Design a protein around this ligand. Sequence first.
Ligand SMILES: [Zn+2]
Lengths: 50, 99, 50, 49, 547, 381
Amino acid sequence: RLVIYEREAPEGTVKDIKEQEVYMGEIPLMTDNGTFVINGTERVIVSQLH
Amino acid sequence: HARSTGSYSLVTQQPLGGKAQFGGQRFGEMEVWALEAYGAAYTLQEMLTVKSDDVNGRTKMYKNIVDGNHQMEPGMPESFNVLLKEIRSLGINIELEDE
Amino acid sequence: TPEEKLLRAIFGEKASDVKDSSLRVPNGVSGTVIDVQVFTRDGVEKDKRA
Amino acid sequence: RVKIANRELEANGKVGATYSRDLLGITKASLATESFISAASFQETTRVL
Amino acid sequence: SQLKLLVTRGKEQGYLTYAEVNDHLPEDIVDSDQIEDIIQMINDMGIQVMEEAPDNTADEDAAEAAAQVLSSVESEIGRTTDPVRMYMREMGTVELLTREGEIDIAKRIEDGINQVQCSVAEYPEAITYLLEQYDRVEAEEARLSDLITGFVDPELAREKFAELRAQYVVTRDTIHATAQEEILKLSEVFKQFRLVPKQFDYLVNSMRVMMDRVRTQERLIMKLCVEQCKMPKKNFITLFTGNETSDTWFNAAIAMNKPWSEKLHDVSEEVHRALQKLQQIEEETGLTIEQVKDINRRMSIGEAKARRAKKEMVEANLRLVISIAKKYTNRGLQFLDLIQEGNIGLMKAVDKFEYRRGYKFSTYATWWIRQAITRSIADQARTIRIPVHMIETINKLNRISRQMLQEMGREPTPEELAERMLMPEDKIRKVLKIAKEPISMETPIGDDEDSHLGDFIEDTTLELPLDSATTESLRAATHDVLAGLTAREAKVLRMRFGIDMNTDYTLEEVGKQFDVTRERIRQIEAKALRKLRHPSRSEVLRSFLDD
Amino acid sequence: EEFDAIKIALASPDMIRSWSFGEVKKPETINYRTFKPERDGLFCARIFGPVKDYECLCGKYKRLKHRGVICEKCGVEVTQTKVRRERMGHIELASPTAHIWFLKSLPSRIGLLLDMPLRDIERVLYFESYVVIEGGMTNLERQQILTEEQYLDALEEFGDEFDAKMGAEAIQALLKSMDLEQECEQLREELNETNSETKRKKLTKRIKLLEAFVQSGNKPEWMILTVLPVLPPDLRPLVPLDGGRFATSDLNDLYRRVINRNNRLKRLLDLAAPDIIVRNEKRMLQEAVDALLDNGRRGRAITGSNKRPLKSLADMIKGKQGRFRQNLLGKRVDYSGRSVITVGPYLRLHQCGLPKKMALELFKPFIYGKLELRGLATTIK
Ligand SMILES: [Zn+2]
């Protein structure tokens, strides 16, 4: 939601709120078995310990 | 796995095969220590001059093997020739005396 | 080359312009071709088997 | 080197060189070599070169 | 001493930690480049290794010099390396504004250029050169726009050079009383022309010939009088300045009861030659040697001031160049390459700026800097160089691919870029095949013992040694088959092909040395192929055609 | 060629010219469209020999017999493409440049050959601080370093007989202006008159070094590269990987960088640009070279488009993966095999089993020979 406030205004009256939906990335979903599929092959992300 | 004459590398004329590492077993360093421990030195010379690198040595070895004359004509390893070139690109004039 | 050329002269066998590179089975396996899939760039006319 | 040199010199009439032997670690006794294509296999290559 | 206490604890312990070395550092030197310099001096000497939080042999014999370098870098630092920072230091020493005095510096530059052009207007050889070039150019051997890039319609230009011929005939063929005024009018007219850069280049070139000839005859007069003849500067300046042209200050000098004069007897005719070629160059121009030397020294000093104005303004604007070059830092080209390319573009900007156009300088020169760095990023960044507008197409595809990647939501297809971009639907494919970098052939594919990707790239120039053996075996076999023919037969069939000789031969040379280029050797050949194609003979030869 | 020992010495600029086969002049590598190599870039045809066996680049001469001829179109010697593996190219550097091995090996070879602290030399190269060379019997010694104001003052002190450089030209002047046997005799004096065991100890140390250097065949000014050689074009390849992605080695990158900056520096010098510009350029070229010869020893690898500190010449001999240890001792081996083992007690301890298939693939050449000898098959095919 891109808002632009007016100059001569810290939080003075808003002059535009152009609300548009933007794409970003493709999060590889999880299969029912906790095994993603990244390039055709079934891959698994091992838990880390730090 | 077994490999008699497969493909070869591109920077150093060594064996390199792919298919199931279709290339010779790594005749590493400790094996060279082994052969020097025995007095055997011909087998070493051909283990890294005829069978492996010297890109005229190997084809002459194959011509000899097919023509039933188990000789060998070694030459000089292509890896050491690459080493001469890589030392010489640096300003280090390495040459081989001839006598 | 040399005498290879003499040979082609001797038997007139047209030396082909094409180089064989067919996908031949790896030396050793012995199997049953259970399933053939043919992906195609969509800039080519799909052949008969596809 | 010293033993051949002063041994031949004592073979002639002159006198050699009284030397006091040393003892070196193997990583330090392999560190000195007449030949460098050997000594560049395992040492730091840049310094030998 | 303190870092040397570090070294003694390292000799005793045999290792360190970053807390240790970070604790024994001199209490101001926290340059990460400098920190690495000292850390490498500490490590590489042995102590080895610096060992972050320990808890095997070591090889080194030159630790004493390293220790000395450390104990020297303690008090007075080994200040800076990493030449980006060296350049930052060396350009930051500037009063980094030229506020409304830029036009003063440009006043200075106009001074230099105008002095050199006026001196040129004093110069005979270049005026004669432009007259001779007027003749040649009028001979269809050149454009009227190449000899001159306009003045302040080259037919007007032709009447202009005709005006030059008029002024120069009146000014030259009256050789003092009025000739000076003639040069004055020629001055007033040539001060308003305008030359191509390489035109003033050749102007300066013949003038540099002039100054170099004059200085070399200076050597011919001095090293034949001053150095060769013990001639001091007193009696030499007494007699050089004042004539410098006629031979009245040398051979009259030899008879002057002087030390040098009593020895110049054996340097007489060479000095006569010196002054004679001197007056010969004069003939090439028509003025005294001192006029030439003063004129081109005025030229050289205006030129020095002009170069100096160049240096000064550009070192004022290097801050501008760095700020602007920061913006392209991942085009695939190093920071300092970008900043130097920008400096060159800045130099061209200072080359052709005028205050009589009203621009301000930063807003003006930003464009030149950016355009030059863009030309650079196009021309010498990609390994396999590709032309400029090709990169244009690549940047077009990238902009439109970002835009289509969210306009259509999922991701674009070449069939669709071939209609957003109005390109022919196939240049997009080829551009998308070409525009990618090459992989660093020593890339680690750690998936194995330890390899680099160059270690797998197989070969394809080699011949399979089966092929080598077959070729040799067939050389031998064909040798035997040619043993199955006659001198005419075997020699003709060899020479007809590449058999054990040099490059093959056709019927011309063949029938030449065989005396018949006709159906004669044709019948020989055809019957040869007849007997050879005869089975029970060529069965082995057909066996060499395995298939 | 059963030759001899190996000899090694320094790189005579005449030597590096006579090795070469034609100047490199441009950072182009190939043509992006018809994948022949540009002329005359890091790759080439008129320099490093042809691409295709016994074919010119342009294609004018294409036969085995024509070898020895250089084309009239692009001067490419019709000669085996494996000559593309043994040629070298000089780069006629515009500004002289110091060889990093001989300046960062601890000691400085240039240092203790000049008898000068390493800090002052890295001053004189990187252009922090002028250095006098043969300052005359006026006020100054020889090695005396200076600074900006100090030099610009001393010019006033003596207009002439005042010889102060800075940059690789400075070190090279110091080296060539040096003469060694004078230092040998002065060192013999210092061993005679001066008497303190550390003093005449390092006296013998430096005198041994200097007379050993003169006993060598070398010279002094060969430690300053005037002519850098380029490795050939087939030890630093540009393979076509299947798919347009070319997989180049990294020396192509390094050479292309050093050649870029050499070109640009020649261009700067021609324009008569101001001094800070040329100084930054000579620093940039010095670091490009110092990355080319080692990519190390100098503070930061000029890392490639990875985060990988990109590999370089002394990095292709160094390390357990370099040519010495990794491929000049432990190489692969034709005619071998390997497999899972088993027991088989039915043997005698001088003989092992060996599978039929592995036997037939190890001993292919001997088998071929035995077959065509016994006549059971006409030819090797
Ligand atoms: Zn050609």
